[PDB]
Structure formats: C-alpha cells, structure tokens
Amino acid sequence: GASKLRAVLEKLKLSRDDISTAAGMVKGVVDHLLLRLKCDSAFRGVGLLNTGSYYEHVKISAPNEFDVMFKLEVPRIQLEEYSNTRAYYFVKFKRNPKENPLSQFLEGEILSASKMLSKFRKIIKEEINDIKDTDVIMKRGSPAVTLLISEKISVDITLALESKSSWPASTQEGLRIQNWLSAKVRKQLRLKPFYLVPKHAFQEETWRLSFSHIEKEILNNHGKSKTCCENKEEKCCRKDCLKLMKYLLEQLKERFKDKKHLDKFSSYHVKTAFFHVCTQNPQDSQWDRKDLGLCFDNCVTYFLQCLRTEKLENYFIPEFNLFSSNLIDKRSKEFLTKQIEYERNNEFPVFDE
Numbered sequence: 001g002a003s004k005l006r007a008v009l010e011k012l013k014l015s016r017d018d019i020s021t022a023a024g025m026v027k028g029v030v031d032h033l034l035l036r037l038k039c040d041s042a043f044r045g046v047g048l049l050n051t052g053s054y055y056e057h058v059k060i061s062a063p064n065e066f067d068v069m070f071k072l073e074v075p076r077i078q079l080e081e082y083s084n085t086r087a088y089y090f091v092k093f094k095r096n097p098k099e100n101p102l103s104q105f106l107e108g109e110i111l112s113a114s115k116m117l118s119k120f121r122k123i124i125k126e127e128i129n130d131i132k133d134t135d136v137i138m139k140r141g142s143p144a145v146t147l148l149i150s151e152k153i154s155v156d157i158t159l160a161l162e163s164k165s166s167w168p169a170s171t172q173e174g175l176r177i178q179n180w181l182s183a184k185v186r187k188q189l190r191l192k193p194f195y196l197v198p199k200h201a202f203q204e205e206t207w208r209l210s211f212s213h214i215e216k217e218i219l220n221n222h223g224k225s226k227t228c229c230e231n232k233e234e235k236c237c238r239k240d241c242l243k244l245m246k247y248l249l250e251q252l253k254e255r256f257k258d259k260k261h262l263d264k265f266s267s268y269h270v271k272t273a274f275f276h277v278c279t280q281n282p283q284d285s286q287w288d289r290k291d292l293g294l295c296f297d298n299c300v301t302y303f304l305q306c307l308r309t310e311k312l313e314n315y316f317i318p319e320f321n322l323f324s325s326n327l328i329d330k331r332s333k334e335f336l337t338k339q340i341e342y343e344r345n346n347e348f349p350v351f352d353e
Ligand SMILES: Cc1cc(Cl)c(-c2cc(C(=O)O)c3[nH]cnc3c2)cc1F
Pocket: 209, 210, 211, 212, 213, 214, 215, 216, 218, 268, 271, 272, 275, 315, 316
C-alpha cells in the first residue's frame, strides 16, 4: 500500500545526482544566452525568471526535460482579451508616452508575438553556432526554443513579458487558497507580477497568462501552519503526493510509447489537479505523512474525475479548461481514464518492482 509508495519515493531519490548535473549543464548554457540577449536593444532588460528548485531558474518538467523562463520587464502594458478565451490576450501599450524598446515588434496597436519570437530564436540560434565549443543543438509558439545538450538533455526556453499591474479579471475567482493558505496570503500573492507567454490559440498574435513563478511560493510554503515541515512534529506528505502523481504519469506515458496515446498529457495537468486537491483538503491533518496511501488516493481519484468529466480548470483562470476538446481530444482522455482507473483499483501495478 503506502510501503510500495514509500519504496517508489526512495527509488526516485537515487536519480538526484543525475538531475542536478543535467541542471548544471542547463544553467551554464542559459547564462551564456543571457549575455547575448542583453546586447540586443530589444532584450536589454531581459533576465532569468526564478521558478525552479535547481539553481533558481531551472524547472524540471520530465526526467531529462527542463523548462527555463526568460522574463522581459514591459511597463505601461494594456491588455485586450481575445474572444472570451479568458487566458489569451492581445498586448497593447497604454498611450505612447515615449518610444519603447519593443516598438519594432508593433503591428498597429498590438505587439506581435511571432515577430518577437523570431528575433529571440535568431539571437539564440546564433549563440549555439558562434560559440560551437559547447555541445548544443536546436530541435522543433511557447516553448520558444527547445535545446538539446549532448544528445540527451532538452531545455525548453520561454520568453515572458513581465507586467507589474493588477492581475486580469479572468483570475478574480482563481487561486482559491483562502481556506487553506489564507486570504492574507492570497492578497499578497496577487500583488506580485504576472507573465504573458507567446502561445498561439488559430495562429495569431495572442499571449497566454502565466503564473508559473507562483508555484515555488506555494510548494515550499504549503501548509495551513506556517511551520508545516519546519520541525519533526509537523511532517506532511503534500510534496510526496505531487512527486508520486508526476511519477505515475511519466511511467504510464513511457508504457504507452508504442502508439503515443498519452502524448498530450503533462506534469502541468498533474500539478493543477494536485493543487485543486490542496484546496479541497485544506488542513495539515488531511496530509499526515502516516496517511500517504490515502492522500495519494485522494489525488488519483480527483485526477480520474477530471479526466472522466473532461474538465480540469486552470488554477488561476477557472473558466479556462485544460481538458477541453480544443486542447486534448476525447479519445486521449477516455484512454487515460481507463488506465488510471485500472491502476487505482489494482493498488498501482505500474509501481511494482
Ligand atoms: C498554486 C500553483 C499551481 C500551478 Cl498549476 C502553478 C503553475 C502555473 C503555470 C502557468 O503557466 O500559469 C505553470 N506553467 C508551468 N508550470 C506551472 C505551474 C503555479 C502555482 F502557484
């Protein structure tokens, strides 16, 4: 039961040295790309967005797949929602007080995502070739660039517009942490900046809202108690449940590699469902380390329900469905529903040794 879950968690620890060295290779490549993008007039205010756990700017998305975000401070930014999508926006500038460094990417009033991505991709592709003394290649809206380091490690590089303004209206009912992390913490988190990433909706100049930077703020300060996991009397299994849910999807994805039916599912879907389970189970006593087996079942059941009902609300944008047929086809969801159902009813044979 939970002894099998705990053995899985022990096994995961053994691949820590390999993830850390890969993250170090990622950190080096990313830091060189930063100095070159800073030379460019359009990207001088660019910087590494702190989202990860490995050297601040390196987020792990799969065994050897890293996600790195570059942020660009964009002041006096006005947003216009694209046709009731709630997550996709056209990007404009308030009222021309002085000619901005991003004026080259303008298309009327709207700032062009593909035009900025083109210069971003062109500066990036240059650093791989100009300094060929490194072992990097390009492989293919956002992630903007996928870099393959020594034919093994892949880094997804995302360009993000930074906005220090109030969060859009579509997020008003999102981040439902009040009963768990408090209204005080919800208020404080909503004062932090938000990001826009050039993800296409069909192919246009829309930008998707991104709250990836908020994850580290909650994952590492996850309890109702401020001292949750800071002493021996307060040990919860929230982080372990998230690792097991990610592990579960990774193992299922690899097992169905022959027909690739699970290709569309990602750790982002698992994290979103995990964080909805934290909202439903707000007390630290609902995540006692001794109750690992039940807490994991709570996570799997909720994820199963999302799949079956074909609905997984974005944690920040409740009217944005990550599981709509627009994003993931009916057959793929029905397929994962069956696999997760079997795994749950059979005490997770995919975790067997
Ligand atoms: C409580 C919490 C939950 C989630 Cl799901 C996220 C989050 C959000 C985005 C995003 O694009 O908006 C992510 N993109 C890749 N990983 C992401 C993680 C952040 C949080 F603070």
